[PDB]
């Protein structure tokens, strides 16, 4: 039946109805009205009700006024989408995607549902824009409006990535987050479609906390399940699986980490980076790439979550020192040591503080000495890290060719420190076997 | 063949009405309508090594009578093959990368992809002499040797509906590498062990 | 975006457009026969843009540089 297969593909690819029963069914598919009423409704009744809904939506938010001129127009009562050309259809698709990104925040409200019902019953968005409509209803997958949209969706018009929804169309129940997350770990296409929808919204600054929390939660659980799948024990397969995970993730996180204007999606990308650095055993250069981009990316609004994710990233590294620009922007951080004590009450900041002290000591600048002194007297490092940091400081003092005055002032303050850090510093002096009084009287004379 | 040809003949290139043979340090050019010898291009160098024509010569599509040769030094020299005249030279960026390993015309107009032995792939306007993209595409031990662009019109951008895909391979490996050239030129996949 | 090098031979070259059947399709009017090399290359560029239009990549961040660096995907 190759002819029946070719004709089945033609009938599935066809878009306009060609017999009266097909026109009546396609006109009967609605969100609000039952089918027995929605068959016998002209486009003046639908436009009156749904324009009352759009008047309420346009009085709520200001930015619906171009759609007042182009989508919800009295002339747009009459336009048939299947009679315009391909470029008119593509521009109408752009206008519809912009309205759906705009209306996704208020979609629990009956004005916004009336506006989406106008788009569905006039422009047939459930058939021609199934991707954007299904993606903008996906963060509301626990509501009866999503159940009704799932009821009126055509089956073969859904994209391949959203074909987990077929049992929930056969039995009209809302799909659970376990089903969405499990299909996100199995298919990279569904995770890429959700992340592409929310990043395309957040570039147009039409974000809302429901969408941001939705994407952050599903990418966090999807990266969790994806790491638990990618783990193999064989060396070359786990190398290739880490590379495939990074190639599937990298654009999304590389944009959502440095999206400065949207701190919610920035914090959600920090959450995904923290999961990726803790659970997945990655490499040191990948973790320095993540830290350098976070350091380039933070604001004042995400500074303390950025520092938490930075503590996790620096903790799960095998190398001991940080790569420059990380230490430069953490110099630019306002209250470093007090914030690190507030984090170290719950998060073990020791390797970050050790790498910070080493990367400051590797600078020959002398505007880092209050930060070095505070990080040493902080009680954040361990005894061995404090000892090797002070040894590197005295070695830098021996390597310098003023500078030595501030160096000796810092060294005499660190030697005359009070507690266990001062005990370990004087013990480090005793095991490097070099006298205090030489450089003491050399700087005092 | 000319009488004083004592070199192996590395590649052939037919365009216009001219067939062009890059031998090793020498280009012999015939006219194809009559299959007759026309002239001989002699690139020159100051050092002994830098004269060697590794890589090859390629034509750009809308460029009249011009071959683009790569040298053992980092230079890509444009040669007008009608009058046999060196018309421009374009220098390698960051000159630590030493030898032109290959070069291929993009589907964009007057943009050439030069691949150096030190690692970088550059794509450059060859009349503006201005670098469009710079990509650290190879290890210094594994130089990029063959590059080819997808002239389909789609295949990039994490959705598959955007163009700009380039495959590349080194001779020391057996894996090809696909780049999406859109944002900055990221990598999108590596097909591993395509051959032994 | 001024062109760096200029050819002196394309001024001198001339090409009949109505003679060849392949070059027949790239004339403007039903009068253009003999065309200099610069205008010939211009029509040839227009026809290449007709066959394959200019893609949108032909018109930094640490993680993006990490992704576009191919020394990171080693085995």
């Amino acid at each position: 039946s190759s002819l029946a297969q070719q004709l089945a593909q033609i009938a599935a690819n066809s878009r306009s109805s060609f017999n009266v029963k097909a026109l009546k069914a396609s006109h009967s598919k609605s969100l609000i009205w039952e089918p027995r009423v929605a068959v016998s409704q002209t486009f003046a009744e639908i436009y009156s009700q749904c324009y009352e809904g759009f008047k309420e939506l346009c009085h709520l938010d200001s930015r619906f006024v171009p759609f007042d001129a182009t989508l919800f127009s009295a002339q747009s009562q009459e336009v048939d989408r299947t009679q315009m050309t391909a470029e008119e259809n593509a521009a109408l698709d752009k206008r519809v995607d912009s309205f759906l990104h705009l209306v996704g925040s208020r979609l629990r409200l009956m004005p916004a549902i009336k506006a989406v019902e106008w788009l569905i019953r006039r422009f047939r968005i459930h058939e021609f824009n199934t991707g954007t409509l299904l993606a903008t209803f996906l963060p509301y997958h626990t509501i009866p409006a999503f159940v009704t949209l799932l009821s009126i969706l055509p089956v073969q018009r859904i994209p391949i990535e959203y074909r987990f929804l077929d049992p929930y169309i056969k039995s009209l129940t809302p799909p659970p987050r376990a089903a969405i997350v499990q299909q996100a770990t199995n298919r990279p296409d569904l995770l890429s479609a959700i992340s592409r929808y929310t990043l395309d919204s957040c570039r147009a600054k039409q974000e809302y906390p429901g969408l941001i929390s939705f994407w952050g939660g599903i990418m966090a659980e999807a990266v969790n399940g994806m790491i638990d799948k990618m783990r193999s024990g064989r060396r070359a397969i786990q190398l290739e699986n880490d590379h495939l995970l990074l190639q599937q993730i990298g654009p999304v996180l590389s944009e959502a980490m440095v999206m400065k204007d949207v701190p919610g999606i920035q914090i959600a990308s920090y959450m995904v980076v923290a999961i990726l650095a803790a659970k997945g055993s990655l490499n040191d250069n990948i973790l320095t790439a993540f830290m350098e981009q976070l350091v380039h990316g933070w604001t004042v609004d995400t500074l303390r979550p950025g520092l938490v994710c930075l503590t996790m990233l620096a903790q799960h590294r095998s190398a001991k020192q940080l790569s420059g620009r990380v230490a430069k922007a953490v110099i630019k951080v306002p209250d470093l040591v007090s914030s690190l004590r507030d984090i170290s009450k719950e998060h073990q900041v020791d390797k970050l503080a050790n790498g910070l002290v080493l990367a400051f000591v590797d600078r020959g600048d002398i505007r880092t000495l209050p930060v070095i002194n505070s990080l040493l007297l902080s009680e954040l490092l361990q005894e061995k890290q404090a000892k090797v940091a002070y040894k590197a400081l005295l070695l830098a003092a021996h390597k310098i060719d003023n500078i030595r005055k501030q160096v000796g002032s810092a060294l005499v303050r660190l030697s005359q420190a009070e507690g266990d850090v001062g005990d370990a510093i004087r013990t480090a002096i005793q095991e490097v076997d070099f006298n205090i009084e030489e450089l003491e009287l050399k700087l005092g004379a | 063949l000319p009488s004083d040809l004592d070199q192996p003949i590395k590649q052939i290139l037919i365009f216009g009405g001219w067939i062009v043979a890059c031998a090793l340090t020498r280009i012999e050019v015939w006219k194809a309508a009559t299959l007759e010898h026309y002239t001989t291009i002699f690139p020159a160098a100051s050092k002994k090594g830098d004269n060697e024509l590794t890589g090859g010569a390629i034509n750009m599509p809308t460029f009249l009578n011009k071959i683009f040769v790569g040298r053992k030094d980092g230079w890509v020299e444009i040669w007008n093959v009608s009058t046999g005249k060196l018309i421009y030279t374009l220098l390698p960026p960051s000159p630590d990368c030493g030898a032109v390993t290959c070069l291929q015309p993009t589907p964009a107009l007057s943009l050439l992809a030069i691949a150096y032995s030190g690692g970088p792939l550059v794509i450059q306007n060859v009349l503006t002499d201005k670098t469009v993209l710079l990509l650290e595409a190879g290890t210094d031990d594994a130089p990029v040797t063959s590059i080819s662009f997808r002239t389909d019109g789609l295949g990039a951008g994490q959705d598959g509906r955007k163009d700009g895909v380039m495959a590349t391979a080194t001779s020391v490996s057996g894996d090809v590498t696909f780049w999406d050239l859109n944002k900055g030129g990221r990598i999108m996949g590596v097909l591993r062990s395509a051959h032994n | 975006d001024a062109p760096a090098w200029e050819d002196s031979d394309d001024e001198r070259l001339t090409i009949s457009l109505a003679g060849a059947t392949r070059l027949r399709k790239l004339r403007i009017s039903e009068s253009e026969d003999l065309v200099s090399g610069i205008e010939y290359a211009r029509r040839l560029r227009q026809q290449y843009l007709r066959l394959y239009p200019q893609p949108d990549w032909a018109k930094p961040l640490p993680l993006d540089s990490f992704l576009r660096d191919a020394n990171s995907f080693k085995v």
Partner: peptide
Amino acid sequence: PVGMPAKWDVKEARKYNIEADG
């Protein structure tokens, strides 16, 4: 099932003939 590849057919593509760069 969806996501399965179809048969291979050579797509007709117009190429720039390079015999006219002369």
